Amino acid sequence: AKGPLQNIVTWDEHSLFVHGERVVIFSGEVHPFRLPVPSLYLDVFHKIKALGFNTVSFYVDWALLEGKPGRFRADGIFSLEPFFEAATKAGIYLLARPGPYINAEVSGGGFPGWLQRVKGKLRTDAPDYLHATDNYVAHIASIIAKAQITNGGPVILYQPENEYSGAAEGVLFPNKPYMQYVIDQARNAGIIVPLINNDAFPGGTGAPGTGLGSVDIYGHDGYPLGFDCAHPSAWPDNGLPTTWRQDHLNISPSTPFSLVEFQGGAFDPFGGWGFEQCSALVNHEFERVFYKNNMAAGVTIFNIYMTFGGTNWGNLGHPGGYTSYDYGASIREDRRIDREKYSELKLQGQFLKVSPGYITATPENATQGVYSDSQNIVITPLLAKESGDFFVVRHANYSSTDTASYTVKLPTSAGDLTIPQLGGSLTLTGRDSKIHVTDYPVGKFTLLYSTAEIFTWNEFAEKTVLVLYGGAQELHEFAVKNPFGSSKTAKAKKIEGSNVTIHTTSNLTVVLQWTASSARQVVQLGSLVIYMVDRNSAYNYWVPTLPGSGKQSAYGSSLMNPDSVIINGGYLIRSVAIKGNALSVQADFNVTTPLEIIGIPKGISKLAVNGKELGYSVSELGDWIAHPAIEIPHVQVPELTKLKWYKVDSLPEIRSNYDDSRWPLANLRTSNNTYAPLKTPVSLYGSDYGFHAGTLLFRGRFTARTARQQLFLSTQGGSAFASSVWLNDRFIGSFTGFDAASAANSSYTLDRLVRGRRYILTVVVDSTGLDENWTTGDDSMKAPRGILDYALTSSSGANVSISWKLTGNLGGEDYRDVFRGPLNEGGLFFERQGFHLPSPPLSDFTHGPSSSSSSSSPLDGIAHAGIAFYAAKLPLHLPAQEYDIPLSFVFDNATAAAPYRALLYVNGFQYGKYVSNIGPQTEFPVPEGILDYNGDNWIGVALWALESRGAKVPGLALKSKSPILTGRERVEVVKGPHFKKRHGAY
Numbered sequence: 014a015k016g017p018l019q020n021i022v023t024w025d026e027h028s029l030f031v032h033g034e035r036v037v038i039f040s041g042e043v044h045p046f047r048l049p050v051p052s053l054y055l056d057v058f059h060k061i062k063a064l065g066f067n068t069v070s071f072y073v074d075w076a077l078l079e080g081k082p083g084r085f086r087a088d089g090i091f092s093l094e095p096f097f098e099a100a101t102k103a104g105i106y107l108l109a110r111p112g113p114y115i116n117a118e119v120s121g122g123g124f125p126g127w128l129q130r131v132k133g134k135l136r137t138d139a140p141d142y143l144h145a146t147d148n149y150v151a152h153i154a155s156i157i158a159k160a161q162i163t164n165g166g167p168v169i170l171y172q173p174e175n176e177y178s179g180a181a182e183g184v185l186f187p188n189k190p191y192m193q194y195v196i197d198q199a200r201n202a203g204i205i206v207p208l209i210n211n212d213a214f215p216g217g218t219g220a221p222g223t224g225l226g227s228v229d230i231y232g233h234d235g236y237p238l239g240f241d242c243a244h245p246s247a248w249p250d251n252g253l254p255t256t257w258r259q260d261h262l263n264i265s266p267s268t269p270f271s272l273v274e275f276q277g278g279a280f281d282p283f284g285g286w287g288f289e290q291c292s293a294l295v296n297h298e299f300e301r302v303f304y305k306n307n308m309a310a311g312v313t314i315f316n317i318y319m320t321f322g323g324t325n326w327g328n329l330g331h332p333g334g335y336t337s338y339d340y341g342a343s344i345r346e347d348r349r350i351d352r353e354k355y356s357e358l359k360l361q362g363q364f365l366k367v368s369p370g371y372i373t374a375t376p377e378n379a380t381q382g383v384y385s386d387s388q389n390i391v392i393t394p395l396l397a398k399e400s401g402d403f404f405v406v407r408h409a410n411y412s413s414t415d416t417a418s419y420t421v422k423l424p425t426s427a428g429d430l431t432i433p434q435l436g437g438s439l440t441l442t443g444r445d446s447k448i449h450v451t452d453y454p455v456g457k458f459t460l461l462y463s464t465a466e467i468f469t470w471n472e473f474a475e476k477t478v479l480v481l482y483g484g485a486q487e488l489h490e491f492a493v494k495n496p497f498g499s500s501k502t503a504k505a506k507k508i509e510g511s512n513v514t515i516h517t518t519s520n521l522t523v524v525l526q527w528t529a530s531s532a533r534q535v536v537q538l539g540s541l542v543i544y545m546v547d548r549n550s551a552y553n554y555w556v557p558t559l560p561g562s563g564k565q566s567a568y569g570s571s572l573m574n575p576d577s578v579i580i581n582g583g584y585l586i587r588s589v590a591i592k593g594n595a596l597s598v599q600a601d602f603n604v605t606t607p608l609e610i611i612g613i614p615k616g617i618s619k620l621a622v623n624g625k626e627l628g629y630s631v632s633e634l635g636d637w638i639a640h641p642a643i644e645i646p647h648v649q650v651p652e653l654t655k656l657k658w659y660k661v662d663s664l665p666e667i668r669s670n671y672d673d674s675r676w677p678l679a680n681l682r683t684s685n686n687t688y689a690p691l692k693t694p695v696s697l698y699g700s701d702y703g704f705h706a707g708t709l710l711f712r713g714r715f716t717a718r719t720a721r722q723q724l725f726l727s728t729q730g731g732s733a734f735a736s737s738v739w740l741n742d743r744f745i746g747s748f749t750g751f752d753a754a755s756a757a758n759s760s761y762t763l764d765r766l767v768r769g770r771r772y773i774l775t776v777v778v779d780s781t782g783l784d785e786n787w788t789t790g791d792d793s794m795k796a797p798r799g800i801l802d803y804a805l806t807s808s809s810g811a812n813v814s815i816s817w818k819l820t821g822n823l824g825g826e827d828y829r830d831v832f833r834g835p836l837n838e839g840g841l842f843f844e845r846q847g848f849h850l851p852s853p854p855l856s857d858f859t860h861g862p863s864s865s866s867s868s869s870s871p872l873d874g875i876a877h878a879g880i881a882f883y884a885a886k887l888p889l890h891l892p893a894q895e896y897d898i899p900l901s902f903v904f905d906n907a908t909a910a911a912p913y914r915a916l917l918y919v920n921g922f923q924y925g926k927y928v929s930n931i932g933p934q935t936e937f938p939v940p941e942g943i944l945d946y947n948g949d950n951w952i953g954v955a956l957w958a959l960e961s962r963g964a965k966v967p968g969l970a971l972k973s974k975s976p977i978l979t980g981r982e983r984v985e986v987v988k989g990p991h992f993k994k995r996h997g998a999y
């Protein structure tokens with residue numbers, strides 16, 4: 014660490030500066046590889062920008078970009094270019110976090126499975142690991158360097174590594190040569206923005222002043238409620254972090270207090286609780302208590318992980334999770350922003366970006382009984398000589414769901430005052446926290462104090478507008494220093510409401526009290542207009558910024574206190590623009606509502622919403638009230654059970670006629686896998702042969718020595734995997750899996766054999782992905798997939814040799830579908846043939862009537878253990894130009910039903926792994942763009958019946974959410990290649 018390398022993004026003790034302007038960085042995490050629809054990135058950025066955020070933080074997943082060692086590819090759906098372009102178009106800056114290690118609940122934690130063949134310890138300066146990362150970092154850091162703000166792009170900060178925070182027993186930590194090598198790779202590729210790290214806790218690793226390996230700005234993370242969503246109402250004792258201001262001053266006082274990841278939801282494992290339950294744990298109450306507690310410590314770089322989670326499509330996730338990565342986030346997996354936590358988070362983002370005094374106020378210790386007579390609340394002050402103070406109030410027991418009545422005694426430029434000055438008590442309801450302010454500037458006006466919280470304010474050309482809110486039935490008070498200027502006659506004017514009271518002191522300080530409710534109060538004091546609303550009303554206000562000009566127009570006039578228009582109403586306001594004498598608004602509506610426009614730019618007289626001009630009513634304050642057309646149609650979707658389903662056997666391996674002469678031989682007598690030394694005479698680890706993704710198969714030939722033989726078989730597929738075994742065409746058994754099992758030891762009898770005859774075992778082993786490697790020195794990502802051990806013995810105990818072949822996805826690291834990437838396909842027959850791709854060769858399938866003996870539908874399934882693949886054309890003709898209509902595939906889970914696993918494919922993209930006996934996921938969203946809403950789609954369902962009685966899908970339906978009338982940019986259909994016969998397939 015030796016200071017800034019450029020003068021665009023700089024920093025000091027208090028904050029980042031961007032173009033010389035101090036700013037609170039309030040960022041949301043988004044992972045581009047979890048939404049492979051380039052035209053929808055702007056949709057996510059619009060929804061994040063509307064929170065009042067200015068930045069997005071993103072990972073890059075190395076395993077998707079260098080599936081074959083030496084061949085970096087980030088094209089098409091893997092290009093970052095549309096992601097950078099969308100950030101520029103939305104006016105969002107970026108924090109780039111490319112790893113190489115990212116964790117992220119992705120397969121391998123970002124490490125490609127070919128790292129299992131690297132002997133040295135991962136995330137150390139073992140040179141085989143270091144050099145294995147060089148090609149990826151040189152490529153990805155050069156792409157991120159071109160997108161730096163110094164070159165007119167959105168990237169302002171770069172994180173090397175990820176939570177490099179501890180190591181296994183006996184491993185050098187911190188390994189400063191290692192850390193510096195990772196920094197040098199990024200510097201050498203042209204990264205000149207500041208480097209920020211993300212220590213897992215305040216451990217000081219990499220902080221400025223620690224010499225070799227130090228970054229520019231020390232950051233750390235926090236997930237104070239953990240990841241088990243079993244008890245969403247339980248906030249345990251000592252869950253609230255209370256030491257971070259002191260920890261910051263102990264570790265890195267010279268740089269801004271930065272929380273590079275702070276909890277925005279939870280991940281959820283197979284057999285977990287579902288993301289609805291995670292969203293109930295990390296809900297709006299969690300945000301108001303925990304996020305304002307971070308403001309109590311003076312956080313000025315603050316990123317919410319996740320803000321939009323997306324989907325672990327195409328096997329990109331790790332075994333510790335399942336297909337969905339909704340994460341319980343503020344923005345759902347299907348991009349809807351209906352959760353209450355979204356609206357609450359908007360209140361907070363909109364408050365910080367008009368409050369520059371928060372940056373320079375000094376956070377002090379938490380107090381009890383100092384700023385209030387009551388001991389039942391804790392108050393943390395942020396103090397300044399003149400530029401305004403902030404007081405974060407919470408229950409003394411942070412978990413409390415009780416209501417507390419209280420008053421405060423706060424320092425102000427007029428002396429210490431017990432507030433309310435006009436009598437009455439303030440209320441703090443259950444799991445709420447508030448920020449009260451003193452000497453808070455509102456343009457040329459000053460709030461001497463306010464108990465009500467600020468949503469926004471702006472100084473328009475002719476009036477200043479301030480929007481204050483409280484929870485319903487809370488009494489609030491604020492005081493405005495003489496707002497009348499010279500004038501002796503000027504008086505307050507009550508514009509709306511009958512609850513607000515007004516008292517003026519001798520020196521013309523105006524003191525207003527009101528009780529928040531559904532009925533807005535509005536008072537005008539000179540050219541200041543204050544709108545006093547309840548929290549639930551404030552949830553529907555929006556503060557789009559007015560564009561500047563040129564390439565960076567979307568970043569507006571400044572990052573703090575930008576020129577804006579205030580809009581009351583709508584499910585989302587995406588943007589405003591001025592076009593001659595017209596204000597043009599892009600908006601989404603999920604329910605009917607009027608739109609009220611507050612702060613009309615000078616000389617504007619026309620209004621348009623989503624490209625349609627409309628009239629409006631004008632209020633006595635000059636606000637516009639408009640009534641755009643909002644038709645929310647009934648949506649009819651095709652019934653899936655009625656499509657024309659085609660079937661193909663996807664376990665032809667077990668038939669007598671099967672030829673496996675094209676399969677790879679599993680003949681490697683040694684392995685470079687140092688984490689799991691071989692127990693078998695040859696390696697049976699998929700990654701040793703280039704297979705890192707999805708289901709594996711093994712074929713073991715032996716000659717029977719005795720009529721009965723005993724097979725011990727140890728398989729490993731990651732958490733919630735399963736494995737099935739046939740002897741020739743005879744089903745032997747399955748390990749049917751459970752959440753807590755990543756491996757299994759199975760013992761089977763192989764009976765009624767003809768001595769001297771050759772037999773072939775077919776062993777199918779699913780993989781739910783590669784493990785993470787979160788503790789440096791413990792090479793956990795190298796846990797192999799396949800067969801860990803076996804023994805075949807004759808009835809007299811003699812050992813019987815087996816010789817082996819194996820496959821994963823066809824071609825392995827020479828994977829066949831460059832467009833959809835290296836992980837999308839596993840090794841099942843129908844995937845190797847490309848039969849999951851659009852327009853499959855129907856002459857290779859069978860069709861027959863449903864509920865008949867020759868049925869070709871997944872609803873009838875199969876009557877024996879095995880694997881079938883089903884495909885059908887699904888035409889859709891939905892009004893996607895005008896409406897955002899989220900679609901999902903729903904499996905019915907039948908309580909008494911034989912176990913099965915299924916794979917869901919949509920236009921060749923795998924968009925679901927369904928595990929009927931483990932769960933929890935039954936509803937699989939797929940985005941518009943992957944689905945074609947005005948065209949033919951191809952759906953695929955693989956059905957793997959685990960038990961001898963077979964299996965079927967009890968029910969499968971397309972589900973739509975309520976249609977949202979939308980002002981988004983149009984979604985382009987992603988053009989995945991259609992089926993083409995594959996040469997050399999097997």
Ligand SMILES: *[C@@H]1O[C@H](CO)[C@@H](O[C@@H]2O[C@H](CO)[C@@H](O[C@@H]3O[C@H](CO[C@H]4O[C@H](CO[C@H]5O[C@H](CO)[C@@H](O)[C@H](O)[C@@H]5O)[C@@H](O)[C@H](O[C@H]5O[C@H](CO)[C@@H](O)[C@H](O)[C@@H]5O)[C@@H]4O)[C@@H](O)[C@H](O[C@H]4O[C@H](CO)[C@@H](O)[C@H](O)[C@@H]4O[C@H]4O[C@H](CO)[C@@H](O)[C@H](O)[C@@H]4O[C@H]4O[C@H](CO)[C@@H](O)[C@H](O[C@H]5O[C@H](CO)[C@@H](O)[C@H](O)[C@H]5O)[C@@H]4O)[C@@H]3O)[C@H](O)[C@H]2NC(C)=O)[C@H](O)[C@H]1NC(C)=O
Nearest residue numbers: 240241243282284285751752753906908929930931932933
């Ligand atoms: C369609 O509907 C179906 C219903 O009709 C539905 O099926 C049901 O699915 C459920 C969910 O999958 C099944 O429940 C689970 O069953 C699991 C398997 O239980 C069998 O095997 C176990 C273990 O056996 C091994 O270990 C033993 C040594 O102790 C040894 O004895 C064994 O030989 C073997 O080696 C047995 O223990 C079970 O026995 C008990 O129960 C049976 C009844 O079947 C009794 O007969 C016995 O007397 C005995 O009581 C059983 O044989 C089981 O593992 C699951 O346990 C978890 O859940 C319960 C809480 O509900 C909890 O008590 C238990 O401690 C386990 O808790 C973990 O998981 C929960 C949920 O996520 C967490 O909240 C909790 O904290 C624990 O989390 C930890 O462990 C997790 C792995 O278990 C791991 O994922 C997790 O990791 C991650 O999370 C944390 C955050 O939480 C992160 O911080 C961490 O980083 C991260 O890794 C964490 O480490 C559970 O009981 C149910 O059986 C099944 N029902 C039926 C009728 O079939 C189906 O799902 C549905 N389908 C769809 C699509 O929805």
Ligand SMILES: *[C@@H]1O[C@H](CO)[C@@H](O[C@@H]2O[C@H](CO)[C@@H](O[C@@H]3O[C@H](CO[C@H]4O[C@H](CO)[C@@H](O)[C@H](O[C@H]5O[C@H](CO)[C@@H](O)[C@H](O)[C@@H]5O[C@H]5O[C@H](CO)[C@@H](O)[C@H](O)[C@@H]5O)[C@@H]4O)[C@@H](O)[C@H](O[C@H]4O[C@H](CO)[C@@H](O)[C@H](O)[C@@H]4O)[C@@H]3O)[C@H](O)[C@H]2NC(C)=O)[C@H](O)[C@H]1NC(C)=O
Nearest residue numbers: 292293296298350351352353356442443552584603604975
């Ligand atoms: C169109 O899109 C819009 C968004 O623009 C969507 O609207 C959102 O819809 C969701 C889903 O319905 C709403 O979230 C759920 O809200 C309910 C209702 O509670 C809210 O509104 C009522 C007023 O109607 C408030 O009184 C509630 O606030 C009180 O209770 C909460 C605790 O729930 C507490 O935190 C507050 O401080 C407040 O307490 C005060 O009053 C109570 C009296 O009840 C009193 O006891 C206390 O002392 C205080 O005085 C609240 O704002 C809520 O029940 C649901 O929560 C439950 O489930 C979630 C999990 O899903 C858990 O996290 C939670 O803990 C509960 O168990 C949801 O929060 C959301 O508010 C709403 N947003 C907006 C802007 O309207 C539409 O749904 C979309 N429509 C369509 C068709 O698409």
Ligand SMILES: *[C@@H]1O[C@H](CO)[C@@H](O[C@@H]2O[C@H](CO)[C@@H](O)[C@H](O)[C@H]2NC(C)=O)[C@H](O)[C@H]1NC(C)=O
Nearest residue numbers: 246247248249250251409410411412413414415
């Ligand atoms: C802090 O307040 C919380 C929330 O009101 C208390 O939580 C309750 O704790 C008791 C005993 O553990 C449980 O029976 C309740 O069910 C809890 N309620 C909820 C909503 O979780 C908590 O005990 C208080 N803690 C301290 C240390 O005084």
Ligand SMILES: *[C@@H]1O[C@H](CO)[C@@H](O)[C@H](O)[C@H]1NC(C)=O
Nearest residue numbers: 130132681683684685686701
């Ligand atoms: C082990 O590593 C070296 C690279 O050092 C490679 O040439 C060799 O093929 C690898 N062997 C196996 C069995 O993976």
Ligand SMILES: *[C@@H]1O[C@H](CO)[C@@H](O)[C@H](O)[C@H]1NC(C)=O
Nearest residue numbers: 727754755756757758759802
């Ligand atoms: C399988 O058995 C071996 C001993 O052969 C043991 O080391 C291993 O832990 C067992 N694995 C599982 C998943 O039980």
Ligand SMILES: OC[C@H]1O[C@@H](O)[C@H](O)[C@@H](O)[C@H]1O
Nearest residue numbers: 115116117118175176234280
């Ligand atoms: O969702 C849990 C998160 O935990 C953080 O500790 C980690 O840096 C992230 O990559 C992600 O794993």
